Structure formats: structure tokens, C-alpha cells
């Protein structure tokens, strides 16, 4: 590990600096180094890890979608052959994306999840496992595609089960998990009705619990509730 010689606290500090500088690849490398110190992560540290990799993989996904669209158009009837280059470059971006997902999943499996006993940490990591298997599923086409989808589903389901037992329905981790699992159902599992049902039930159960919250918690929860409503509007 290229970060093995740097203090854990220095890695965390530099991750925060990298975030301010919008250097998300650096931020992800620093947080990977911090995880590899072997200690559990605090809530703030978990969010630095997730922000870093979400931005890295989000850029890769956006690029993959552009290239996939060009490739599909190059393969339509009447298109002029342009050679192997579009496929090759889409494959290059795809392989880099898969590498990032494998890296995150590797951190979760060695050993973040197994040491995470509190609901806030364990649900957060299982949500991340579902998300990164979901990103693998977006690009998957081979013998293992169904197993990739099922790995995402299984991680999301375990996170959901814990969240329903241990967290209030307005907890922002629980809300974001449900938002993302609902998107998994719509876009990956070809289950739009399940996606819509989950988003609606999540929104309504959160609504009914808002009365318990402070102003700041209310803002956190209603932000994610608005995303649930945005998706419901897109889908209905």
C-alpha cells in the first residue's frame, strides 16, 4: 500500500483537503489508506470514504454511458463501420470501473463489514456493498451477471432488515438505503412495481415520524424524502 507509511490522522486530514480541492481520486486513495490501517471508521470517516468513491465511480459511470451509447449507434443498421476502437475504449473504461468497484468491495470484505456491529455502521457498509454490486451489474453481460445482481440484492436486503429493526424510519442512512434499493429494483431487477412500492412506503413512514425530529434532523430527512418523491414522479 502506497499509503502504508502515512499516519492515519494525516490520511484523514488529506482526504478532507482533497475534497475541498475536488480531487476525488486522491481523496479515495487517502481513505483506502485509512481503512487499511485496520481500525474501525467513525461516522465522519465513513462518509469521507463514501463521498470519495461515489465521485470517482460516478465519473466512470457517466463516461461508460456516453461510450456505450456511441457504441450502440455504431452497431445499428446502416451505420458505417468505424473499427474496434469504440468497443475497445468502452471496455477500457469498463475495466477501470470494475476495478474501482472491486476495490471498494474488497475494503468492505476485508474487514469493514465483519467488524461493524452498530446499526449505523453496519447498515452503511451493507448499503455500500449493494451500491457497488449495482454498479457492477450496470455493466455486466456474462455468465455471472445474475449472481452479481443477486449479490447486490442480498446486501441491500440485509441492510434493510437491520434498518427496520434498529433505526427510526426518518434515519437518513435508512432513507438513502431505501432510495437506492428502490432504484436497484427499477433499473437492475426489472421490478418497477417493487421500486415504486418501496419508495412510497418509505416516504410515508418517514413523513409520519418527522414530528419527533429537531429542525436539523428534519432538514436531513426531508432532503432524502424529496429524492424519493422525485423518483416517484419520474416513474408514475
Amino acid at each position: 500500500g502506497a499509503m502504508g507509511s502515512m499516519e492515519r490522522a494525516s490520511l484523514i486530514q488529506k482526504a478532507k483537503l482533497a475534497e475541498q480541492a475536488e480531487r476525488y481520486e486522491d481523496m479515495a486513495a487517502f481513505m483506502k489508506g485509512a481503512v487499511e490501517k485496520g481500525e474501525e471508521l467513525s461516522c465522519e470517516e465513513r462518509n469521507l470514504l463514501s463521498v470519495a468513491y461515489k465521485n470517482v465511480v460516478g465519473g466512470q459511470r457517466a463516461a461508460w454511458r456516453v461510450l456505450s451509447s456511441i457504441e450502440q449507434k455504431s452497431n445499428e443498421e446502416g451505420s458505417e463501420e468505424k473499427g474496434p476502437e469504440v468497443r475497445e475504449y468502452r471496455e477500457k473504461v469498463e475495466t477501470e470501473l470494475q476495478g474501482v468497484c472491486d476495490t471498494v468491495l474488497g475494503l468492505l470484505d476485508s474487514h469493514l463489514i465483519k467488524e461493524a456491529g452498530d446499526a449505523e455502521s453496519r447498515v452503511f457498509y451493507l448499503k455500500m456493498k449493494g451500491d457497488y454490486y449495482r454498479y457492477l451489474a450496470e455493466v455486466a453481460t456474462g455468465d455471472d451477471k445474475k449472481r452479481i445482481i443477486d449479490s447486490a440484492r442480498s446486501a441491500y436486503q440485509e441492510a434493510m432488515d437491520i434498518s427496520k429493526k434498529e433505526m427510526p424510519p426518518t434515519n437518513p442512512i435508512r432513507l438513502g438505503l431505501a432510495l437506492n434499493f428502490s432504484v436497484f429494483h427499477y433499473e437492475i431487477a426489472n421490478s418497477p412495481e417493487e421500486a415504486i412500492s418501496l419508495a412510497k412506503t418509505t416516504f410515508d413512514e418517514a413523513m409520519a415520524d418527522l414530528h419527533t425530529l429537531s429542525e436539523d434532523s428534519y432538514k436531513d430527512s426531508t432532503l432524502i424524502m424529496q429524492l424519493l418523491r422525485d423518483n416517484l414522479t419520474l416513474w408514475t
Partner: peptide, 5 residues
Amino acid sequence: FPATV
């Protein structure tokens, strides 16, 4: 695309 966090 739909929203995720």
C-alpha cells in the same frame, strides 16, 4: 437517471 445517494 433516477436519484441515488
